[PDB]
């Protein structure tokens, strides 16, 4: 049967400049009062599933595991591609579209359960084709906080039904590896280089050194870094990287000594 | 008497770049304790009464009962406009400035019972002139939200005495409308054209498949569809309209066979 | 011993636009499950720890005696410079690096008990060198919250051994003083004249009328007035001055008769 997890995790690309991503939200308090609604970002890149599929991958982690992860990127909104319901091995609970954006969430902590949500009794009814993030993905988010079993959501699936985002690794060839993500507040740049594979080398071609944290060179000055997932990183010494060396993800990167 | 309200809906124009919202907020915490404050957006243009106006339309229906709806962009703040502390028909309470900011919110649940915020027992002593929205509007919603009764808040108004703002209606004429909003995340344009007066053709003349969901049409292609309000709407597949053709609100629309 | 403090106040320069700030929090839930969660803001400009500070002043009277300000602008993470654990004389507790930024917060209700946070049975471990802000601050703020002694977050250290950023004080000279910050939202200026040394002159020269409100001027007119916090203010009547006359954080500005 069902458990209460009281922690829903919300993410959305919809932004948080209108109504939007509070109405969902309206919907959710409706079906759980009880219910902690915690914002992950609603600035995901219009229709970008990878990008909000990027920015999920640490929350299975950093979250307790009485939290309902609800996921809402949905350009497929109206159309054949259906949402799902997954219980994974922490005991957490995810809500989103079957289309890649909980990929990287899922290899954190693997799918033990799955379920297309195909159940009106778990729905906000009546469903608006253009809104199946807050009508079925939010709405059916609240009703597994509250307590509703996973097999009451619709049919169960195999876990290889979930489409996943293919993932490119960093190889030892010197170490090759490519841009995943740009930290966008400060302009840190972060690759698929694990620690770990590893004065050195990087190609432009640049000698940086490789520091434990930021204030280990002069301001302004670059560095390489191990970030918090593992993987390594570069940034300016509390300047924006992306500003002096305007990379993309992508982009390749080779580490050499 | 009053009734508990657990659940703060805050609405305003000051936005989130800093502690301005923050500090309302604070304020309410201290009146009410137990409250659940939620933001609708902070990020309504500086002074636009319409746009947050129209921002709150659809937050009386899709929030519960127990409710206070915290509206907060004030030019008026210090001079002889009032704050207003409503009843709605669907028993939810809202408060704001009588500046026609929640006439959009009361189209949607009618006001069974209004006041005037003038009692400085639901005040916070002593209030700033050029900070109305957190010394009366953040004060006022949070005892509200404790449980104080409505008539100790001021007295009492005709609902003719709150300030409307003017909506212009669609009208067949081929169907006349006009822009009413758009959709900032995403580009998509929101027309007053009901399901209900209604490939069509779009007046710069466009021809346009009119769908269900966006999805139905390939990606970078413009249709038509019904919103979740019931009205007419003009989107890209997977990309921003009004970058294609960038209309803005006020501007008219015709729909023809 | 400790107390429960249910509030946590939460501040940053990670920005809200990615998941950064939402994993702090999903730590904080963590350790303290019954905490309410309040973001100040996360959109300090990047390692602008005057910024921060500034944001921070007001929010000690603002808030309720049970909160925990977590303050986290740390561009100095992993380095020498520790994080500090503080009980004001309101009695609210904050939590954040020994860099200057707990300083106005400090000035409104000063330091009673101050502790460096070196224990790491209130840290989240391990303890990632770049992201001290999650890890050592975010972590005893929900340590804090949950009801741990201030005595066992490290040794205790006395008062001036907290990092205190200056502030020009405005001076008589006609009065001469300087802009603090600038209101993103409005364009509203604001400076250090308080109330107090007070149609005036402000020298580019301008003849301003001193009013208690915005709306006392004709729109798109320029006005002198007091802010919530007693310091003196310019300002357009629903318009933004610094898009009008460009001022920055530091120039002077003289007002005579
Ligand atoms: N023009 C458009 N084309 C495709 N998808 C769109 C869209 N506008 C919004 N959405 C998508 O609609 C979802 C609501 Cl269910 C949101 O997640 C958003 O991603
Ligand atoms: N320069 C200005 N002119 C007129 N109104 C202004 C203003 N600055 C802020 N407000 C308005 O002051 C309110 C606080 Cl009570 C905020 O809602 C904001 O809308
Ligand atoms: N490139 C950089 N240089 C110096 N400091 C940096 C930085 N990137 C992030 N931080 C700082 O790292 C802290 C996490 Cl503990 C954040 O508060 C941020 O201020
Ligand atoms: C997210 S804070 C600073 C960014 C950094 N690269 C870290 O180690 O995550
Ligand atoms: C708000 S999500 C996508 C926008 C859309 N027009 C809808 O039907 O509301
Ligand atoms: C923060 S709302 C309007 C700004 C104003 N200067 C006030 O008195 O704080």
């Known amino acids: 049967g069902?458990?209460?997890?009281?922690?829903?995790?919300?993410?959305?690309?919809?932004?948080?400049?209108?109504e939007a991503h509070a109405l969902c939200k309206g919907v959710m308090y409706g079906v759980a009062p009880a219910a902690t609604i915690v914002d992950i970002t609603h600035d995901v890149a219009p229709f970008d599933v990878?990008?909000?599929a990027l920015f999920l991958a640490d929350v299975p982690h950093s979250f307790?595991?009485?939290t309902v992860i609800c996921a809402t990127?949905?350009?497929?909104?109206?159309?054949?591609?259906?949402?799902?319901?997954?219980?994974?091995?922490?005991?957490?609970?995810?809500?989103?579209?079957?289309?890649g954006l909980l990929s990287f969430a899922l290899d954190a902590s693997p799918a033990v359960e799955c379920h297309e949500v195909l159940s009106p009794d778990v729905m906000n009814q009546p469903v608006t084709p253009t809104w199946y993030s807050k009508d079925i993905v939010?709405?059916?988010?609240?009703?597994?906080?509250?307590?509703?079993?996973?097999?009451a959501v619709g049919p169960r699936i195999d876990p290889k039904?979930?489409?996943?985002?293919?993932?490119?690794?960093?190889?030892?060839?010197?170490?090759?590896?490519?841009?995943?993500?740009?930290?966008?507040?400060?302009?840190?740049?972060?690759?698929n280089i694990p620690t770990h594979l590893i004065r050195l080398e990087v190609k432009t071609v640049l000698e940086l050194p490789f520091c434990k944290t930021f204030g280990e060179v002069d301001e302004?000055?670059?560095l390489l870094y191990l970030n918090s997932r593992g993987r390594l990183a570069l940034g300016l010494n509390q300047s924006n990287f992306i500003e002096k060396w305007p990379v993309v993800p992508?982009?390749?990167i080779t580490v050499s000594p």
Chains 1, 2, 3 share one sequence.
């Open 250 to 252: 992508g982009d390749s």
């Open 138 to 151: 939010a709405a059916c988010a609240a009703h597994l906080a509250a307590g509703t079993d996973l097999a």
């Open 73 to 99: 990127v949905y350009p497929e909104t109206g159309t054949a591609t259906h949402t799902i319901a997954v219980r994974n091995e922490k005991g957490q609970l995810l809500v989103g579209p079957n289309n």
């Open 50 to 52: 990878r990008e909000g």
């Open 161 to 191: 039904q979930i489409v996943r985002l293919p993932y490119a690794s960093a190889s030892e060839v010197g170490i090759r590896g490519e841009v995943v993500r740009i930290d966008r507040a400060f302009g840190n740049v972060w690759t």
């Open 220 to 222: 302004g000055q670059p």
């Open 2 to 18: 069902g458990m209460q997890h009281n922690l829903i995790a919300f993410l959305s690309d919809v932004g948080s400049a209108d």
């Open 64 to 66: 307790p595991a009485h």
